[PDB]
């Protein structure tokens, strides 16, 4: 890395974009003398499937059910130039519907504890809360706020003064709305993001078809000396086929659990709050995350702040005025090549250096690398104008 | 949840109360050819009890012994209108005494590693530190401060300006003192909070009585062919009785351990510091927690801040003055129906909007939802008065 | 602890020092009918060594490889009065070299996955980043800054206003440079800090020598009835000798792993960031930590802030002026025995109390313990001078 004792790097521009990521949460859960002894083995095989089945409902609850009472929104689409009408809530959202549309003989299939209706309700409650009130740390929602005022605090949390959001509100809203529209067409048109979920579904569709492809009709036709041989052979190979099936479900379940753990982590860290980690809940600095319902999983839309062009500015520890040293009240002192300004750290904002944004401590002989500039008050000009 | 693009919810009042909760920390720990073979089984049973016994002293140390050197207070009862004389330190506190007053044949009972005197010393040291100095993050106490100045920082930590404590110091102190008095009478009069500890004590009193109710006098009277039969039967049923006893102690010990883990968590999180989680160390926002000694456990008195009546105020992103946009320096802009004020976020405090509590950035054409108001300086009035 | 309702303890001076600690990270990893049955046992013994060998490279990566792309510095020695020329980068640093200079028959020794060159590169990248740019939270470096401006933020993080660093920059730099020079001579002269690493090295040097000290020459000379006896006895005792060796390596490996876990924790907590825990990454308040390469381990140089002399000042909640109560804008009000000043909390800095560093709320009848003083504005003096 390049370095210099008077060089400071400050971003001068930024963009906001919406990153879409899809995390699988749950897998389809299924169930299924010497004969009795085989029955014992069957039970153990079923137990393994049962343990998985519990885990799968285990996963669903950990990811979605982080709110205790369900909430719903009023018919508001415009939250300050921001278009939420295609993520909000069949009464499902238009985007969720895209995800839904695009993604015997002893063998039975179980229902989920949380059905599509319950999941839609939990997702709606989480989303309704995030947008209008915001969630607190501990339990429940916080207090109602318009919406830009919520974003303003998320900007402050990444070191950006609460004036950037409002000055660039039109640009931010347009970039947000554009990204949502692009996600609209992208998810439908190209099988990109919709990869992980389809893969999981295809795999057990295959596992089930394999299990199936792999007693009374024998007993009624064959005598004991032969019937027992055919029966024992069929039972053994079928138990082996089930063992293979169970093993495949267990391994895949482990991958789903790992994904569910991540989804739950993000839900509690950046959906119900804000992530401090960069490049975690989306590339760049996290501001907000809005959950969406999906087949066998959850989809997150991450709104992130990404800095752009950076410039090399000349800096100084402090400014000398009348022999006294003036230190910056909040920001740092930088030179644009002809004039000195005071700016915040994470975004170039050339404020004029005045006595109202500085404090006085020490002197010009003590401070190292101090520069000679003019730091003026807003009072004398008024005195000169008022009666002179 | 109801929502509106210009509606902000702000609390206008609050109350402070003391929540009492009781957490069990430790359980009474006890100990107890073919004959030798039974002896092996007895040893294994004793091992299980030994493992528990270690855990029980394990628990006590984790919860109470979080301070290395013992401290004591001066004879101060009044810490700024706050009455601490009935929680401070037989040299035990009057409240602790209420808790104390209200709550062979191979079988022996063990002493604790930390006796009542040692526990009283640790509790006194933790409490002495909390009240006068406050604890730091890492090791030891911080620096001596009166007391209201400690509370002031705990208020700041929940988003309330350090003026609320002082303006309402009389009301806060009265509510605190009242709560302690109520706890005084409540704990003594009604067997409510004093439930969990009594339950634990009663259970092993029963377990021990059961074990007891459930050799030489046989050998000296019966011949071998009969004596061995009676002896083997008695040993077997006694080993079974002990197995049941050990199992009961193990299960209960697990519940005690879970409770001890929670008590230790709270001790390090909200007693030696401040909890950020709402509704954890008491309902509402945590400010302080004072530990108290108790039979077989620890009692915490949590001082929490609870907001009350909320009003729906009309808000605006910024205020227009001379065509330039004025943004709030710290708080938000709200309207009470006739006038605009600037307040903090978590408590309604209608400060007059002046140039000294705002900053100027951008203009009235760019900001969305900007309102027309007057933002004035404190200088012109002085100029007009001084020489005009 | 002593206590009083109007006494506040404030530090008036400080020192900065460099604490050196050495943590071992990795251990030398090694490898090694009835005969075949013994071979099975040998394989199990080798497996245990293999598991250790994996762990040892496991440790190295966890501690050092926390940066993905390698970086190098420009030839800068002076970073603002701070001498870094003896810690920066044979192309190894002079201090690292001191550490390096001071610290068959079936038996083989394995190489590390990360060789000395790779470790030097990772260490250089971590150090290059720490000094010039500083690391961010999530991934990669942050933004380029001189260096004093980085320290200034680390001071702010411990409650000290960003003016202390600059006013005392000469004293801080001299204390830092002095400490590094002392470490220079200390590490070379006295076998103090260089204890843990030498101990680990000596122990397996001994383990290997012991293993060695503890077939065809028998078969070609002895007949079956005797040859088998000698051979079986030698194999058994050699397998026992190896079992002892493996056990010793496993136990020591556990100690190394515990140390590696700590080193990795510090690397991610206080090297790539800042520790909030006091007396963790060095005595006192942590500011910075610079890694250094070492034989079989890592060396950390911790730069810590230590407060010194404290005084007992008289304090007051607020100051009365014209019947209105004035509260401190940032700090606290203290009396030095003759005059009232406003200072920050963690360092005595007697600023003059003026209307520009206070705010007005409430009145002199409500506030408890309010004192009568003069709080003046900087305006009237200008009005009196300008035209009177
Ligand atoms: C790379 C980048 O961020 N470019 C933007 C540009 O698109 C935008 O028009 C301009 C508005 O001032 O800010 C900058
Ligand atoms: C619900 C509630 O907090 N009510 C209080 C009231 O008891 C108190 O007298 C008043 C003092 O201004 O503040 C409010
Ligand atoms: C214990 C201690 O910190 N003493 C220092 C002293 O060495 C230094 O000369 C002085 C400079 O003002 O500050 C103080
Ligand atoms: C949101 O986008 C839809 C198009 O999908 C459009 O019909 C609607 O008017 C937009 N609403 C706002 C507030 O922009
Ligand atoms: C800043 O300086 C570095 C080092 O010379 C250079 O690589 C970089 O491109 C410069 N940045 C700009 C915007 O010129
Ligand atoms: C610095 O900013 C001023 C505006 O205040 C501008 O006039 C000047 O040209 C800028 N200097 C450079 C080198 O861009
Ligand atoms: C920065 O480094 C240059 C040498 O390249 C030196 O002359 C100058 O005085 C240094 N300035 C500061 C503030 O250290
Ligand atoms: C500022 O001006 C004074 C003379 O008024 C001079 O002595 C001092 O060196 C100058 N400082 C700098 C950084 O040029
Ligand atoms: C505290 O309460 C007791 C009554 O239990 C009373 O006697 C004592 O005077 C009170 N002290 C203060 C400072 O209020
Ligand atoms: C604020 O508005 C909501 C929605 O209409 C209403 O339910 C609530 O009662 C109002 N609050 C007050 C104090 O009137
Ligand atoms: C708003 O506050 C002012 C006091 O500054 C008061 O006179 C006025 O009546 C209040 N308006 C309402 C609707 O309460
Ligand atoms: C708030 O919503 C109303 C529609 O109910 C609209 O007329 C008004 O312009 C919106 N104001 C803002 C700031 O969005
Ligand atoms: C403020 O007054 C100006 C005229 O001076 C007017 O053009 C502008 O629209 C007004 N703003 C609002 C929010 O009413
Ligand atoms: C750093 O110390 C070395 C002595 O080891 C000295 O030669 C060099 O000049 C010093 N550099 C600075 C900037 O002090
Ligand atoms: C502050 O007061 C305590 C209690 O009397 C005393 O022990 C301590 O030495 C005093 N500090 C100083 C610097 O005198
Ligand atoms: C308090 O500080 C002033 C300087 O503003 C000094 O003159 C005075 O002697 C100090 N008082 C004491 C007791 O040190
Ligand atoms: C401090 O305690 C003394 C008694 O030693 C009392 O007279 C004084 O009024 C108390 N001051 C405050 C602010 O509590
Ligand atoms: C301050 O002076 C007023 C008289 O102007 C007096 O009533 C009040 O008690 C004094 N306050 C203190 C703390 O001495």
Do B120 and B226 have their domain in common?
Answer: yes
**Using CA atoms, how far apart are residues A295 and A306, in angstroms rounded to an integer?**
31
Give the residue carrying structure tokens 């193990």: B250
Q: Is the CB of B15 under 6 A from ligand 2?
A: yes
Question: Is the beta carbon of C148 within 6 A of some atom in ligand 7?
Answer: no
Do B303 and B316 sit in the same domain of this protein?
Answer: no
Residue C289 β-bridge partners: C302
**Closest residue (by CA) to atom 12 of ligand 1?**
A13
Domain end call among C259, C290, C307: C307
In 3D space, the residue among B356, A378, B383 whose CA is nearest the CA of residue C384 turns out to be: B383
Measured torsion, CA atoms of residues C83, C88, C92, C96, in degrees rounded to the nearest 10: 70
Question: Which sign does the torsion angle of CA C317, C323, C324, C329 carry?
Answer: negative
- Cβ neighbours for A373, distance < 8 A, ≥ 6 positions apart: A319, A320, A321, A340, A353
Contact criterion met (CB < 8 Å) for A327 and C162: yes
Neighbours of B124 (CB within 10 A): 22
**Separation between Cα atoms, residue A110 and residue A28, nearest integer Å:** 8
Shared domain for B38 and B117, answered yes or no, is: yes
Pairing of the two strands B319-320 and B371-372: parallel
Contact between residue C295 and residue C99 where contact means Cβ atoms under 8 Å apart: yes
Same structural domain, B36 and B77: yes
Domain assignment present for residue B3? The answer is no
Which of A280, A307, A334 terminates a domain? The answer is A307
Please state, in angstroms and rounded to a whole number, the distance separating the CA atoms of residues C56 and C296. 10
C177, C83 Cβ separation under 8 angstroms = yes
In a domain, C58, yes or no: yes
Say what the alpha-carbon torsion angle A269, A270, A274, A275 is, to the nearest 10 degrees. Answer: 70
User: Which candidate, C348, C154, C353, C149, places its Cα nearest to that of A367?
Assistant: C149
Q: Using the structure block, give the residue that is written with the tokens 């971003």.
A: A11
On chain A, the residues whose CB falls within 8 A of the CB of C76 are: 3, 5
User: Coil, helix or strand for B139?
Assistant: coil
Give me the count of residues in chain A: 388
Q: Cα(C348) to centroid of ligand 15, in Å?
A: 16
Residue A223 CB neighbour total at 10 angstroms = 8
C-alpha torsion sign, points A258, A264, A270, A271: positive
Among C145, C272, C388, the residue to mutate for chain A (most A Cβ within 10 A): C145
Atom of ligand 8 nearest to the CA of A364: 11
Q: Residue A67: which of A21, A129, A151, A114 has the closest Cα?
A: A129
Task: Say how far apart CA C222 and CA A53 lie, in whole Å.
Answer: 66
Please list, in sequence order, all residues whose beta carbon lies within 8 angstroms of the beta carbon of residue A384, skipping any fewer than 6 positions away: none
Is the separation of the CB atoms in B84 and B77 below 8 Å?
A: yes
Q: What would the two tokens of residue B221 be?
A: 């009277």
Cβ atoms within 10 Å of A176's Cβ, excluding its own: 20
- Tokens 């890694």 belong to C291
Contact indicator for A8, C144 with CB cutoff of 8 Å? yes
If asked whether residues B344 and B268 sit together in one domain, one would say no
Tokens of A281: 């809940």
**Ligand 6 centroid distance, CA of A14 (Å):** 21
Distance B5 CA to ligand 4 centre (A): 17
Question: Residue A3 domain-assigned?
Answer: no
Which residues are within 8 A (CB) of C388 and not within 5 positions of it... i.e. 6 or more apart?
A: B387
Give dist(CA A327, CA A369) in Å, integer: 13
Burial of B205 per CB tally in 10 Å (0-12, 13-18, 19+) = exposed
C315: left (phi over 0), alpha (psi -120 to 50) or beta: beta
Q: What is the DSSP code (8-state) at residue B354?
A: B
Q: How far apart are CA C242 and CA B80, in angstroms?
A: 71
Q: Which of B208, B292, B287 is nearest to B25 (CA)?
A: B292
Q: What is the distance between the alpha carbons of residues C68 and A218, in angstroms, rounded to a whole number?
A: 65
* Cα A196–chain centre separation: 16
Is C356 found in the same domain as C238? no
Distance, CA of B95 to CA of B89 (rounded, Å):
10
Asked whether C267 and C66 are in contact (CB, 8 A), the reply is yes
Ligand 3 pocket check for C15: Cβ under 6 Å = yes
Residue A11 covered by a domain: no
DSSP assignment, residue C337?
S
The verdict on C281 and C324 lying in the same domain is: no
Instruction: Tell me which residue of C53, C97, C59, C91 sits closest to C73, measured CA to CA.
Output: C91
Bridge partners for A320 per DSSP: A325, A372
Domain holding B316, by residue range, is 310-386
Residues 278-337 of A with CB under 8 A from C: 278-280, 310, 315, 317-318, 325, 327, 332
Interatomic CA distance for residues C46 and C200, integer angstroms: 21
- How many beta-carbon pairs under 8 angstroms link A with B? 91
- For residue B73, being part of any structural domain is answered with yes
Residue of minimum CA distance from atom 5 in ligand 14: C86
Nearest-atom index, ligand 3, CA of C15: 3
Q: Do A166 and B277 touch (CB under 8 A)?
A: no
Q: Quick one: which of B21, B58, B26 has its CA closest to B201?
A: B26
Token digits of residue C306: 């230590």
Query: C87 and C77 in contact (C-beta within 8 Å)?
Result: no
The two three-digit tokens of residue A12, written as one number: 């001068």
C338 C-beta closer than 6 A to ligand 16: yes
- A8 found inside a domain: no
Question: What are the chain A neighbours of C169 within 8 Å (beta carbons)?
Answer: 367-368
Structure tokens at B164: 């609320």
Nearest to B318 by CA among B338, B339, B340, B337: B340
C10 in a structural domain:
no
How far does the centroid of ligand 9 lie from the alpha carbon of residue B148, in Å? 18
Work out whether the CA dihedral C202, C203, C208, C213 comes out positive or negative. positive
Do A304 and A151 touch, CB atoms closer than 8 A? no
Cβ contact, residue pair B9, A132, below 8 Å: no
Question: Nearest CB to A163: which of B8, B11, B361?
Answer: B361
Counting from 1 in the atom list of ligand 1, the atom nearest the Cα of A15 is 3
Among B235, B213, B180, B256, which Cα is nearest to B42's? B235
For residue A336 the two structure tokens come to 């644009």
Task: Tell me whether strands A340-343 and A358-363 are parallel, antiparallel or unpaired.
Answer: unpaired
> Which residue, among A280, A288, A273, A268, has the nearest Cα to A82 in the 3D structure?
A288
- Helices C34-64, C224-266: axis angle to 10 degrees equals 10
What the block records as the tokens of A116 is 């599509």
Residue A210, both tokens? 């394999």
Regarding the beta carbon of C337 and ligand 16, being less than 6 Å apart is answered yes
Task: Closest CB to C5: pick one of B73, B79, B163.
Answer: B79
Looking at chain B, which subunits does it touch, using at least 3 CB pairs closer than 8 Å as the criterion? A, C
Q: Which residues have C-beta within 8 Å of that of residue C260, sequence separation ≥ 6? A: C23, C24, C25, C26, C59, C60, C62, C63
Record the resolution, in angstroms. 3.7
Question: Per residue, what are the HEC states of chain A?
Answer: CCCCCCEEEEECCEEEEEEEEEEECCCCCEECCHHHHHHHHHHHHHHHHHHHHHHHHHHHHHHHCCCCCCCCCCCCCECCCCECCCCCCCCCCHHHHHHHHHCCCCCEECCCCCCHHHHHHHHHHHHHHHHHCCECCCCCECCCCCCHHHHHHHHHCCCCCCCHHHHCHHHHHHHHHHHHHHHHHHHHHCCCCCCHHHHHHHHHHHHHHHHHHCCHHHHCCCCHHHHHHHHHHHHHHHHHHHHHHHHHHHHHHHHHHHHHHHHHHHHHHHHCCCCCCCCECECCEEEEEEEEEECCEEEEEEEEEEECCEEEEEEECCEECCCEEEEECCCEEEECCCCEEEECCCCCCCECCEHHHEEEEEECCCCCCCEECCCECCCHHHHHHHCC
If asked whether residues B291 and B322 sit together in one domain, one would say no
Comparing CA positions, the residue from C300, C282, C249, C251 lying closest to residue C64 is C300
3 state SS of C175: helix
Is the same domain home to C216 and C74?
A: yes
Cβ neighbours of C163 in A, within 8 Å: 327, 359, 361-362
A245 near A237, Cβ under 8 Å? no
The strand order across the sheet containing C371-372 reads C358-363, C324-328, C319-320, C371-372
B138 Cα: distance to centroid of ligand 10 (angstroms): 45
- Method of determination used here: cryo-EM
Q: Which residues pair with C376 in a beta bridge?
A: C354
In a domain, C178, yes or no: yes
State the Cα–Cα distance between residues A270 and A286, nearest whole angstrom: 8
B360 shares a domain with B236: no
Map tokens 């390469």 to a residue: C293
**How far is the alpha carbon of A94 from chain B, nearest alpha carbon, in Å?**
22
Q: What is the 3-state secondary structure (H, E, C) of B30-81?
A: EECCHHHHHHHHHHHHHHHHHHHHHHHHHHHHHHHCCCCCCCCCCCCCECCC
Q: Dmax of chain B from CA atoms?
A: 126
Q: For C114, phi and psi rounded to 5 degrees?
A: -110, 105
Tally of structural domains, chain C: 2
- Give the 3-state secondary structure of residue B205: helix
**How far is the C-alpha of A306 from the C-alpha of A284, rounded, in Å?**
5
C285-294 and C297-307 beta bridge pairing: antiparallel
**Would strands C108-109 and C30-31 be described as parallel, antiparallel, or unpaired?**
antiparallel
- The label of the residue with tokens 């012991």 reads C210
Instruction: Quote the minimal CA–CA distance from C171 to chain A in Å.
Output: 11
Among A14, A280, A318, A361, most C C-beta atoms within 10 A, so best to mutate, is A361
Residues B340 and B323 in one domain: yes
| Ligand 8 atom 13 nearest Cα | A371
User: Same domain for B43 and B126?
Assistant: yes
From C341, C350, C332, select the one nearest C374 (Cα to Cα): C341
Q: Across the interface, do B278 and A136 touch by the CB < 8 Å criterion? A: yes
Nearest C-alpha of chain B: how many angstroms from C278? 4
Q: Return d(Cα A317, Cα A358) in angstroms, integer.
A: 12
Give B386's strand partners: none
- With the C-alpha atoms ordered B47, B48, B53, B56, is the resulting torsion angle positive or negative? positive
Q: How is residue B60 written in tokens?
A: 């006590």
A56 closest CA partner among A64, A44, A67, A68: A64
Partners of chain A (3+ Cβ pairs below 8 A): B, C
C229: number of Cβ within 10 Å: 12
- By C-alpha distance, the chain C residue nearest A359 is C163
Residue B76 burial by Cβ neighbours in a 10 Å radius (0-12, 13-18, 19+):
middle
* Domain boundary pick from C263, C282, C307: C307
> Is the CB of B128 less than 8 angstroms away from the CB of C1?
yes
Torsion from C-alpha of A31, A34, A35, A36, nearest 10 degrees = -60
Q: How far is the CA of C324 from the centre of ligand 18 (A)?
A: 11
Q: Is the CB of C202 under 6 A from ligand 3?
A: no
Dihedral over Cα of A234, A239, A242, A247: its sign? negative
């Amino acid at each position: 890395v390049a370095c210099s004792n008077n060089s400071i790097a400050i971003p001068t521009n930024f963009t906001i974009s919406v990153t879409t990521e899809i995390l699988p949460v749950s897998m389809t859960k299924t169930s299924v003398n010497l004969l009795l002894q085989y029955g014992s083995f069957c039970t153990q095989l079923n137990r393994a499937l049962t343990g998985i089945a519990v885990e799968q409902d285990k996963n669903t609850q950990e990811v979605f059910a982080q709110v205790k009472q369900i909430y719903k929104t009023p018919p508001i689409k415009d939250f300050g130039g921001f278009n939420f009408s295609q993520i909000l809530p069949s009464k499902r959202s238009f985007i969720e519907d895209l995800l839904f549309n695009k993604v015997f003989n002893g063998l039975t299939v179980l229902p989920p504890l949380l059905t599509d209706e319950m999941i839609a309700q939990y997702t709606s409650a989480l989303l309704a809360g995030t947008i209008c009130s915001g969630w607190t740390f501990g339990a429940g929602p916080a207090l109602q706020i318009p919406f830009p005022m919520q974003m303003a605090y998320r900007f402050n949390g990444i070191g950006v003064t609460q004036n950037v959001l409002y000055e660039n509100q039109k640009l931010i809203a347009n970039q947000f709305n554009s990204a949502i529209g692009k996600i609209q067409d992208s998810l439908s048109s190209t099988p990109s993001a919709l990869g992980k979920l389809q893969d999981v579904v295809n795999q057990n569709a295959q596992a089930l078809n394999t299990l199936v492809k792999q007693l009374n009709d024998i007993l009624s036709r064959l005598d004991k000396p032969e019937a027992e041989v055919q029966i024992d052979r069929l039972i053994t190979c079928r138990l082996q086929s089930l063992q293979t099936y169970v093993t495949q479900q267990l391994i895949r379940a482990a991958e789903i659990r790992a994904s569910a753990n991540l989804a739950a982590t993000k839900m509690s860290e950046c959906v119900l709050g804000q992530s401090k980690r960069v490049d975690f809940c989306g590339k760049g600095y996290h501001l907000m995350s809005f959950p969406q319902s999906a087949p066998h999983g959850v989809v997150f839309l991450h709104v992130t702040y990404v800095p752009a062009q950076e410039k090399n500015f000349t800096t100084a520890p402090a400014i000398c005025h009348d022999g006294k040293a003036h230190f910056p009240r909040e920001g740092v002192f930088v030179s644009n090549g002809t004039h000195w300004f005071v700016t915040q750290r994470n975004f170039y904002e050339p404020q004029i250096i005045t006595t109202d944004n500085t404090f006085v401590s020490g002197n010009c002989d003590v401070v190292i690398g101090i520069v000679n500039n003019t730091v003026y008050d807003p009072l004398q000009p008024e005195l000169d104008s008022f009666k002179e």
